[PDB]
Ligand binder design. Sequence first.
Ligand SMILES: [Mn+2]
Ligand SMILES: [Mn+2]
Ligand SMILES: [Mn+2]
Ligand SMILES: [Mn+2]
Lengths: 319, 319
Amino acid sequence: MAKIIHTADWHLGKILNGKQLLEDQAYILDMFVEKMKEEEPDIIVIAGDLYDTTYPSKDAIMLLEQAIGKLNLELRIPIIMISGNHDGKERLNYGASWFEHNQLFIRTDFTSINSPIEINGVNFYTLPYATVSEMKHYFEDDTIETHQQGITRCIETIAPEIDEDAVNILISHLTVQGGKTSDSERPLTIGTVESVQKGVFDIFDYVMLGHLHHPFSIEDDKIKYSGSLLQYSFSEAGQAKGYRRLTINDGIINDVFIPLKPLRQLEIISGEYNDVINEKVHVKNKDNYLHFKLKNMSHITDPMMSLKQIYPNTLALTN
Amino acid sequence: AKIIHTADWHLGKILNGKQLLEDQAYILDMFVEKMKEEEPDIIVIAGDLYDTTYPSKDAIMLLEQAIGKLNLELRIPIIMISGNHDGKERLNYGASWFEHNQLFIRTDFTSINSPIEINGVNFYTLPYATVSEMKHYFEDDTIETHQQGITRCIETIAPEIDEDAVNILISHLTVQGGKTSDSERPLTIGTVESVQKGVFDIFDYVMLGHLHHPFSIEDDKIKYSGSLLQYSFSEAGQAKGYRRLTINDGIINDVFIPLKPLRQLEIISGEYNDVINEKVHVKNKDNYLHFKLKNMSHITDPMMSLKQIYPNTLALTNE
Ligand SMILES: [Mn+2]
Ligand SMILES: [Mn+2]
Ligand SMILES: [Mn+2]
Ligand SMILES: [Mn+2]
């Protein structure tokens, strides 16, 4: 009878068209920590992609240490944290041996799936992201060529020792077949297929995932993505983002999505140039991050920073 | 009451275009092997752990592994002062979780007013700070020297102190008349960065760092650990290691214990012919060498020919 919070894809330190989202990401984490006080969850899982790069800025590392500190030290919520494809494993893994004392777990090794973490009588199976090279070389299997082959092979390590009488939840970072895609995700593959099938996770009672930034990328009773904390591309402009709440109520699993409201959103406006700089066009919020696809090709003086006096946080201009 | 005194690791240090991390991992390995022998009460690292404020992934992993063996595997308390070279936020990352295993990281110079006491000995922490940073905390224009800011620092703890107790100061600065090395940076912007030994007269002992010669200062109360390795050909032939401090009912005794490196820095003189025919005395052919030779004629690439027989040659000078 526990309450589990499922988030993923923080992508701290991300830059969109030369603009830093750290001012925004600090705001959305303020709201994340604020509503976690009201929930008082039994555990939080962060299903990968915490940093946008393998070389996070001094300011971005501060942000993670501060947010994770409030959640785990002063709110005293246990945390499970796996790595993603963007993540720098060792930069994320730093100091993990001291963190385990206060129930803060970090996993950057797909080998760790054989070692599940048990919180509130629930078994969490962690499987950080791994490429197929580094997967096929641990198993020494040369017939591992697609992401699914290596992922299924990882689960056959743990399938015989798994406990069927408890609640087994898999935390991973991968692409499920049939999920919608945004342009804030990098491809995991070269010319192979990166998607894993639904039947791979038949053993697990539940699957908490991250990689696809759309929260409703996969509609399923057993498998579900958290989605990104914010809109990280204009493909997701306007769509709601946030976190997911999962409650196991005496063997009855229920999941719901809770939206978060950002400091500003991403919006796309099409129309005439003189309609938008003369403010004869409707905009939901003129402080938004904006992509302008406009008319009148000839642009007297600078086209864009004439628009920046009206709309300060404009990012791209297409014509 | 046995204390280990070390400083100036400068992890990630580059010397003449080569990373010294392979050497530093060997000397840190030998340091904790000698920490298994000497069962110590405290290990003190008086600053300058990294070489820049943005260390590489491998350098960060080395500090985590080394510190981990000391604090966790061997259950040794550690105190970490911030030096003039390393970044304060990268050094204190996760310091809140580390205090539960008695691992103390101080990067704030205003932290001197809250000493750490273990085994009946009080440790006052004075991480490095600049006069522009020290000027703003006290809102004083009196302090334009580095010495006055330190005097200002100790005056905070001067009323709040027990002269009865063993009071040790850990800091990172320059003492008057101390010997210099070329791998050290200037601490101020073109003034006098040195401090007289009278400022530290309220303390029973001063453990310092910044000056890489173990015997920079010859004084009973103020001593320098010195750098882990020779980080410049100015330090060629200098013994390096750590200081051991033993206390028994108020009487302090100090020793210097040297670590023998995998490689040394030698400056070799002679002629190209004798040197390449191995008839000039070289301690170890594997050592890092700077050659001042005199055969300025017949050799195609004199460095490559030299590297054939002396692999770790670093610099060549001809006369
Ligand atoms: Mn992602
Ligand atoms: Mn991803
Ligand atoms: Mn220094
Ligand atoms: Mn130094």
